[PDB]
Amino acid sequence: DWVIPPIKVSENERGPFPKRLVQIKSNKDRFNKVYYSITGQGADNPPQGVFRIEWETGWMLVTRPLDREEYDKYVLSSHAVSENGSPVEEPMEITINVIDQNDNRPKFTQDVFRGSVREGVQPGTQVMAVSATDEDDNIDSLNGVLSYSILKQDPEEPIPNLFTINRETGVISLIGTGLDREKFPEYTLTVQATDLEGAGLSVEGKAIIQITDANDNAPIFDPKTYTALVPENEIGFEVQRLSVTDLDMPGTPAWQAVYKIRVNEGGFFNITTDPESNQGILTTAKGLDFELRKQYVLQITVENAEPFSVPLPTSTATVTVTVEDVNEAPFFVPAVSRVDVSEDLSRGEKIISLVAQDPDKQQIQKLSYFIGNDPARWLTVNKDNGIVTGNGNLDRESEYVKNNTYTVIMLVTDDGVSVGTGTGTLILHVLDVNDNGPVPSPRVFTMCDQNPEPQVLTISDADIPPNTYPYKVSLSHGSDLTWKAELDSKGTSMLLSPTQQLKKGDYSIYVLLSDAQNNPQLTVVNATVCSCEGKAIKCQ
Amino acid sequence: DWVIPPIKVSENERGPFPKRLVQIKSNKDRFNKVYYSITGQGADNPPQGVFRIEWETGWMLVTRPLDREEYDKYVLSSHAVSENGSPVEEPMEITINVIDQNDNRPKFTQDVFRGSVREGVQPGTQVMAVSATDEDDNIDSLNGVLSYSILKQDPEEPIPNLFTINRETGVISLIGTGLDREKFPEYTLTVQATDLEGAGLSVEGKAIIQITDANDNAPIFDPKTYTALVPENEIGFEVQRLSVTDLDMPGTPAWQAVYKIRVNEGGFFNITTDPESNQGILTTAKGLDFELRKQYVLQITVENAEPFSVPLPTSTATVTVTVEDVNEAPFFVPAVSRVDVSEDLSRGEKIISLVAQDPDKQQIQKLSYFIGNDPARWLTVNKDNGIVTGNGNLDRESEYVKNNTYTVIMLVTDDGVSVGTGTGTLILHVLDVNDNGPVPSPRVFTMCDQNPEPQVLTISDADIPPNTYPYKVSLSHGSDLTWKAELDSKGTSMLLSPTQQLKKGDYSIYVLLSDAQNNPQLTVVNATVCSCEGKAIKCQ
Amino acid sequence: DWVIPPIKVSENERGPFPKRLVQIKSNKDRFNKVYYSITGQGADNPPQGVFRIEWETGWMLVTRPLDREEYDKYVLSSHAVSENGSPVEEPMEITINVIDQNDNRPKFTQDVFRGSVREGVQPGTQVMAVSATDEDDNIDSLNGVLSYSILKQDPEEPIPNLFTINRETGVISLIGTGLDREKFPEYTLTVQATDLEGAGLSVEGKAIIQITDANDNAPIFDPKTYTALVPENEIGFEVQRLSVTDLDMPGTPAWQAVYKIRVNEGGFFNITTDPESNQGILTTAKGLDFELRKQYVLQITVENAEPFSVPLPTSTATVTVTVEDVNEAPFFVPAVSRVDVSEDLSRGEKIISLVAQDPDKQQIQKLSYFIGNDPARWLTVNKDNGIVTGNGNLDRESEYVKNNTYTVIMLVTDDGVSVGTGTGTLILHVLDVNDNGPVPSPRVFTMCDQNPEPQVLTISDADIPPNTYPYKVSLSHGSDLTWKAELDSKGTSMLLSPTQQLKKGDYSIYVLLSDAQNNPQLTVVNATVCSCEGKAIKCQ
Ligand SMILES: *[C@@H]1O[C@H](CO)[C@@H](O)[C@H](O)[C@H]1NC(C)=O
Ligand SMILES: *[C@@H]1O[C@H](CO)[C@@H](O)[C@H](O)[C@H]1NC(C)=O
Ligand SMILES: *[C@@H]1O[C@H](CO)[C@@H](O)[C@H](O)[C@H]1NC(C)=O
Ligand SMILES: *[C@@H]1O[C@H](CO)[C@@H](O)[C@H](O)[C@H]1NC(C)=O
Ligand SMILES: *[C@@H]1O[C@H](CO)[C@@H](O)[C@H](O)[C@H]1NC(C)=O
Ligand SMILES: *[C@@H]1O[C@H](CO)[C@@H](O)[C@H](O)[C@H]1NC(C)=O
Ligand SMILES: *[C@@H]1O[C@H](CO)[C@@H](O)[C@H](O)[C@H]1NC(C)=O
Ligand SMILES: *[C@@H]1O[C@H](CO)[C@@H](O)[C@H](O)[C@H]1NC(C)=O
Ligand SMILES: *[C@@H]1O[C@H](CO)[C@@H](O)[C@H](O)[C@H]1NC(C)=O
Numbered sequence A, B, C: 001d002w003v004i005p006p007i008k009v010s011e012n013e014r015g016p017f018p019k020r021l022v023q024i025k026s027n028k029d030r031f032n033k034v035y036y037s038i039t040g041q042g043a044d045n046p047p048q049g050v051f052r053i054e055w056e057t058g059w060m061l062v063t064r065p066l067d068r069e070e071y072d073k074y075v076l077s078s079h080a081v082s083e084n085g086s087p088v089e090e091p092m093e094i095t096i097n098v099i100d101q102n103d104n105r106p107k108f109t110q111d112v113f114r115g116s117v118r119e120g121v122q123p124g125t126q127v128m129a130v131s132a133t134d135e136d137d138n139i140d141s142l143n144g145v146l147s148y149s150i151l152k153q154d155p156e157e158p159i160p161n162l163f164t165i166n167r168e169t170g171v172i173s174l175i176g177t178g179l180d181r182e183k184f185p186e187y188t189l190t191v192q193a194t195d196l197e198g199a200g201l202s203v204e205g206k207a208i209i210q211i212t213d214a215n216d217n218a219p220i221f222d223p224k225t226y227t228a229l230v231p232e233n234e235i236g237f238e239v240q241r242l243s244v245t246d247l248d249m250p251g252t253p254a255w256q257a258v259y260k261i262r263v264n265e266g267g268f269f270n271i272t273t274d275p276e277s278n279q280g281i282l283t284t285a286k287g288l289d290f291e292l293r294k295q296y297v298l299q300i301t302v303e304n305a306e307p308f309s310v311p312l313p314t315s316t317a318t319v320t321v322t323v324e325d326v327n328e329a330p331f332f333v334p335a336v337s338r339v340d341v342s343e344d345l346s347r348g349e350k351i352i353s354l355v356a357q358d359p360d361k362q363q364i365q366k367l368s369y370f371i372g373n374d375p376a377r378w379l380t381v382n383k384d385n386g387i388v389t390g391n392g393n394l395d396r397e398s399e400y401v402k403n404n405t406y407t408v409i410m411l412v413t414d415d416g417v418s419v420g421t422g423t424g425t426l427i428l429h430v431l432d433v434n435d436n437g438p439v440p441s442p443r444v445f446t447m448c449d450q451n452p453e454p455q456v457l458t459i460s461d462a463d464i465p466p467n468t469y470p471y472k473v474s475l476s477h478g479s480d481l482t483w484k485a486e487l488d489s490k491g492t493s494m495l496l497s498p499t500q501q502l503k504k505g506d507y508s509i510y511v512l513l514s515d516a517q518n519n520p521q522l523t524v525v526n527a528t529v530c531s532c533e534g535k536a537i538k539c540q
């Protein structure tokens, strides 16, 4: 058909109501009276009564103002019946479009936006982002397009133009330079959005930016030069602690100190760090020792764990140390294999005039010499002059003496001012003299009767050679009660044989030898005889 | 075609709206999309929006509740066009019928109906008529048919069921008996009408009935026996008035009294009625008279103008009258032609001893007798004894006496106690005596000279016969100066003639007559003579 | 709805254009002016402008002629808008069907169809098949149904009604009889197809049929009787070749000849066939031989490889052969163990008068007898009379003679007219004569001195028994130089013993024996003696 165009109507209209929109006519009215009515939402349906028609003229009206924001369009159905009561025309659809008007102010997405950036970054860096909206049209008008802006950053210091915002997108960026968490950490700037691309109505928001941290700062010592005293030897011990103040953020690696000495003399120092006021705690690496050095001039520089965000001054601490003195024990010089001395020494004679030395050249402390180790008592010392003399009777020949030795240990004490011990061994070579003289091996025989065979006997000397070289056998009172002497060819033994057919048991034979001579006297080597033929038998 | 049935819908429907009625489909939809719309009253025409269709499904709906009472039917036209824009199917008529529901209470034609009936009527008599209506259907349901009834007549007295009403027609009739305007004249009864032949809903009205009047009552006298006094004679006059009280309606013929005496003695009484308290006003018909009766016992009954609507007691009034006395004039008995008396009566003699009578036997009142009528003075009366004597000289012979009469009238007066007159005539026969005597007719002649002829002369008597019978003529001194006497044969005249030739004029002749005798003397009848021959001539 | 029926329109319509089809009206025109338009293919869409409507009346028209063959149907959409500009009725679909008309001539599937069948088949046999089409309707009309037919087969010979075609299917079949590839191998017939079942329009095609082959023909010889000459013996050799002509198809088994002789005399003939003009090549099976037969009358029939498609005449070839002569070598009759002849024969005496025979009775050819084999020269032949005489000295006794034999072979030659050899052996029984006489075995002794034991000696004869029967020993000059003779009992040896004690070595003994007598003289059997006792010892 020839339909009927949609009807545009403005919003928030205002004048004298009613307002005729249009007029409709059924031509089938030649016959009876026609009754015009109309139906739909806004008509008889909810919102009832916005539009109504004059049953007799065919006029359509808007009865009151409208807000497209509420309902932006309506569709209606129109009718025409006869007085008799019958419909005449197939109904007719009707449309109305509600044209937008700038009745709406915009509104920010949130009531407050927050942001953060680091202090050391470069100009032209994107920080935050902000939103807002207008409910009016924005597809055929500007009643709903906004334009963003900024008008007041607080801390109007260092300067007041650190940022800008993209008018269309509302994004903010760092424009200037001079950000420092250490002086001004959080800005509060006021934003506004406007109707018709900055032309219409405006509103406010608030965005707040916190500033991350940077290693803008270096560490600073609170003393620059310290001093402490120290002892030579127990040690590995705490000398002095140090103080400092970095200014970036505390629990952070831009706040933790790292040290080191420049030069470690004997490399006898270690230094650690501590999460207190991360003071510098210095200590001794390997004890000290001395009388060698009293002075210690060393320097320690301090850094952070992480590198610096800028060239900065490295700052050292210069420190002086002094070693207190402890006084140590003295010592005999050697451990003496000294005196190759003979057995004939006169009880009270100079053996070893000895001396001991003591470390501490503070030496105005003497000591006393004491002896100590010990198989039995011979020797003697002058305690205030360390003089070892030889008292007593010695005898290389016999008991304690093991290999050609006699080892003895002695002491010495550090007095004068405190304490001390000195353990020193002393081996002294004893010597030989020909003391003893020759002696027979077996002392009792068992001779036989009829024809006894030679009674083997031998010789032994306690002395050391030559002193036991060859012999000379001799038979004293009974050199004839019949007894005849004899030597083995290979030196050592002697052959003892009677020369008479003598008696039934129990009787001695006086013996007498010599080796350089010395002559011993020996003696009786008794002789038990019991009935027989010729071989030395078990007796009775 | 295969059309589409009308759609019945209930009224005052109620549930969740919408409500699908039916669904339509164009089959010509194989080609494009079809758009369903619909038109008419209730559609796009006033009432707009009661029904609407889903352009894409083809469903028809009722959008809200309806009242058949407002619109009981709708007719609609349905359409289907293509997206391109062309119609596909010849439209389609659609009908909806709205089924009635009992939403309407009935209502009385008027707010109050009035009525009236007469008190004496019979049970089974139609009085009033009442109306009312219901607007719901009444041609397929009972939602609109009523049933009439009554539930409270006021004046629940004599009894409380004087009427009934026809449930279907609403007409009322008298059912009981005992209606009396005189005690309870106006009832007020409450009526009700109901839905579904007395089943549904009900309402009230009010009908008020006034009761016409009836001659239920008879008239009642307020005195039952009266008395009054009365006078004999002026009369036709008011004796006494009477009082009564009928009880029906005042200005009415059931309240106007009618009387009558039972027996009218001499028929000398009349009685009228009067629109005052319609008292009985009695009077005298024809004066009374008396000394004949003093008592009057008569009775008067009283009715109404119109007959009675019931047998009733007729009630009489018994009354007594007494006649006062007035005293009347006396009367001579007759009117007397009494005394044939002669002329010779002696002055002072009994003529008529008369008497008069007076009516009132209360008679202790005398009177006095006076005379009255009159030619001249003769007679006389004794006033305290009525005695007529005769004084004076009378004389039948002459003047007043006309025929043989003399009539006289006299009076008498009622004294003793008040007043009176009595006119009575009296004729008295006078009589004859022979008084006078004879006399000559002519007294002067004219005789002649030479030979005079007889001078005729005659005779006359004043008396009555026999007293004038025949004569005897006589001539006294001059019985001869010549004169000679003579009588006519037929008695009366006399012939006078000289006997000498005598002289010239002037001279008399002495005459003398008689009749019983009496003898008169008459006289001189002079005679004038003058010169002549013989005939009585005129003289000189 | 009340839609609107499709509109049938004829094709290739022709009269005055335009042509009103139908008129449409919107009734919603009571209000404004309505504008009628219409859309679709054939409307505003390609083919644009075939139909158009009068915006103000509502008439629809066809503007020009149509061909259903191009487009057989159209669908359109109609519209109606108001002057103000609004559509009034949902558009309306519109349809038009284009009714077919016989505007199309049919057409053959191919431009030429080919076919083939074999000559000997039976009437009522399906050969080819042909197609064609019409584009007009063929489902409600006959505008597209064809009827097939034939109207000219070429080679209107033998007869001109060899086939028919099924009018509905277009299939062709053999109806007549007389097909021969050999005379008329390929027919060319003209076909036609027609509209409305042979009623409408027609067209032509061409179908060509080739005729397969059949064994209608038998083989025919070109000579009927041949002749050839032949030789007796080298042989297995080609006698004569034969010619023939079958008429069916060449490279085919209905053209390959197969032979055979009827009777094979000694079964000495073979005959093969050859893919040349498949001539009959006859040969000799097993040489011939003769002088036995000169004539050969034999017959050979010829067939094809595959049987015949009809009874036919088998045709033989009758042939005559003649054997040329070759002349062979002669032969002695036997191989002779003939002459039991004695050693005493006189040099030049009849031994074996022999004869030889020669085959060829053409015998006017003689030969010459030559001898040949040979240990040495005795015998002799007359060459022109074959006479074996005996020249020479023979001697059964000794050298060549092995068992009692002497075998010799000789020859004979075929001359007179050509060549020849005859090898014949000849064994001749030689006989015994007593030639030689007895002789001693050892000829030299070794006798001893003191007492020599008998010198054993024996005897031997070269003759055959009785001729060597027993002996007679004799001692000639020295029958006493002392020597005494003796025979062994069992005949053969002789005991030689002295009778004197004679001398020291070197000396003979004259011996003399006999066997029939013959007497030999023998001789000296010398005797070497050397010093001794009695046993024949080794000497010196
Ligand atoms: C930003 O926020 C802080 C915290 O309240 C406030 O003190 C300051 O004034 C605001 N503006 C700037 C530029 O710091
Ligand atoms: C020396 O060392 C001491 C240690 O107690 C310290 O207090 C002082 O500051 C250092 N410097 C000097 C000059 O004494
Ligand atoms: C670190 O020490 C320096 C030296 O006096 C001082 O100026 C600074 O304030 C200290 N740091 C802090 C956080 O006080
Ligand atoms: C530390 O060493 C420096 C370097 O010589 C010296 O001046 C100072 O006296 C030493 N000790 C103290 C107490 O500073
Ligand atoms: C000597 O030295 C040895 C080795 O230690 C020791 O065992 C011994 O007791 C010391 N004295 C003597 C008398 O040997
Ligand atoms: C010296 O050392 C000795 C070791 O034998 C020890 O017993 C003693 O206590 C020390 N003397 C002093 C004075 O400290
Ligand atoms: C020295 O004396 C000390 C203290 O008893 C002891 O421990 C040590 O063994 C002794 N000997 C030496 C050689 O120092
Ligand atoms: C009827 O109407 C009268 C007048 O008001 C009223 O007094 C009376 O109570 C009513 N009912 C009857 C039965 O009289
Ligand atoms: C008598 O008549 C008089 C007239 O005045 C009246 O008042 C009275 O009621 C009557 N009856 C009697 C007994 O007096």
Ligand SMILES: *[C@@H]1O[C@H](CO)[C@@H](O)[C@H](O)[C@H]1NC(C)=O
Pocket: B220, B221, B222, B244, B245, B246, B247
């Ligand atoms: C009429 O008179 C009688 C007699 O006393 C009385 O009972 C009645 O009430 C009177 N009528 C009227 C209306 O008073």
Ligand SMILES: *[C@@H]1O[C@H](CO)[C@@H](O)[C@H](O)[C@H]1NC(C)=O
Pocket: B225, B226, B227, B296, B297, B319, B320, B321
């Ligand atoms: C009326 O007449 C009656 C009848 O005799 C009598 O009783 C009465 O006294 C008369 N007068 C009066 C005053 O009632």
Ligand SMILES: *[C@@H]1O[C@H](CO)[C@@H](O)[C@H](O)[C@H]1NC(C)=O
Pocket: B375, B400, B401, B402, B405, B406, B407, B408
């Ligand atoms: C007599 O009576 C008559 C008749 O009425 C009257 O005219 C006359 O005057 C009376 N007297 C005399 C004397 O006649």
Ligand SMILES: *[C@@H]1O[C@H](CO)[C@@H](O)[C@H](O)[C@H]1NC(C)=O
Pocket: B413, B419, B420, B421, B422
């Ligand atoms: C009597 O009647 C006479 C009539 O002649 C009249 O004049 C007079 O007044 C009456 N007398 C009395 C006393 O009433």
Ligand SMILES: *[C@@H]1O[C@H](CO)[C@@H](O)[C@H](O)[C@H]1NC(C)=O
Pocket: B421, B422, B423, B424
């Ligand atoms: C009686 O006297 C009266 C009073 O004057 C008078 O009227 C009447 O005529 C007189 N006559 C008679 C006859 O009563």
Ligand SMILES: *[C@@H]1O[C@H](CO)[C@@H](O)[C@H](O)[C@H]1NC(C)=O
Pocket: C153, C154, C155, C156, C186, C187, C188, C189, C208
């Ligand atoms: C069939 O085709 C052959 C080959 O061209 C032609 O010669 C002949 O005339 C045609 N017709 C018949 C019946 O052979």
Ligand SMILES: *[C@@H]1O[C@H](CO)[C@@H](O)[C@H](O)[C@H]1NC(C)=O
Pocket: C223, C225, C226, C227, C228, C229
């Ligand atoms: C005979 O054989 C010869 C062979 O060369 C042949 O040519 C000939 O046709 C055959 N027939 C006769 C009758 O010669």
Ligand SMILES: *[C@@H]1O[C@H](CO)[C@@H](O)[C@H](O)[C@H]1NC(C)=O
Pocket: C220, C221, C222, C244, C245, C246, C247
């Ligand atoms: C075969 O030989 C016969 C005999 O003459 C002849 O008629 C026929 O034509 C020959 N075949 C052919 C193909 O020439």
Ligand SMILES: *[C@@H]1O[C@H](CO)[C@@H](O)[C@H](O)[C@H]1NC(C)=O
Pocket: C225, C226, C227, C296, C297, C319, C320, C321
């Ligand atoms: C072939 O044999 C027949 C049969 O006898 C004979 O007639 C003929 O001569 C022979 N040879 C030839 C040359 O045909």
Ligand SMILES: *[C@@H]1O[C@H](CO)[C@@H](O)[C@H](O)[C@H]1NC(C)=O
Pocket: C375, C400, C401, C402, C405, C406, C407, C408
């Ligand atoms: C005899 O015949 C034999 C047998 O073949 C042969 O070996 C020999 O040479 C012939 N001649 C003689 C003399 O034996």
Ligand SMILES: *[C@@H]1O[C@H](CO)[C@@H](O)[C@H](O)[C@H]1NC(C)=O
Pocket: C413, C419, C420, C421, C422
């Ligand atoms: C005959 O046969 C012999 C065989 O010994 C042969 O050497 C010779 O050549 C033949 N002779 C002839 C004439 O062919």
Ligand SMILES: *[C@@H]1O[C@H](CO)[C@@H](O)[C@H](O)[C@H]1NC(C)=O
Pocket: C421, C422, C423, C424
């Ligand atoms: C005959 O002579 C022929 C020709 O040399 C030879 O081959 C054959 O061996 C001879 N012998 C016989 C028995 O034929």
Ligand SMILES: *[C@H]1O[C@H](CO)[C@@H](O)[C@H](O)[C@H]1NC(C)=O
Pocket: A301, A303, A311, A312, A313, A314
């Ligand atoms: C000082 O030395 C440190 C390392 O110990 C270095 O990191 C720092 O950058 C140096 N100072 C300067 C100004 O380069």
Ligand SMILES: *[C@H]1O[C@H](CO)[C@@H](O)[C@H](O)[C@H]1NC(C)=O
Pocket: A334, A335, A336, A409, A423, A424, A425, A426
């Ligand atoms: C004493 O000192 C010596 C060093 O000469 C050492 O060898 C020995 O072990 C020490 N003996 C003791 C017990 O100290």
Ligand SMILES: *[C@H]1O[C@H](CO)[C@@H](O)[C@H](O)[C@H]1NC(C)=O
Pocket: A402, A403, A404, A405
């Ligand atoms: C004695 O001397 C030997 C040789 O020097 C030495 O090795 C040994 O230790 C000493 N003492 C003993 C008990 O062997």
Ligand SMILES: *[C@H]1O[C@H](CO)[C@@H](O)[C@H](O)[C@H]1NC(C)=O
Pocket: B301, B303, B311, B312, B313, B314
């Ligand atoms: C009494 O008399 C009257 C007429 O005077 C009459 O109408 C009435 O009915 C009578 N009373 C009775 C009870 O009949």
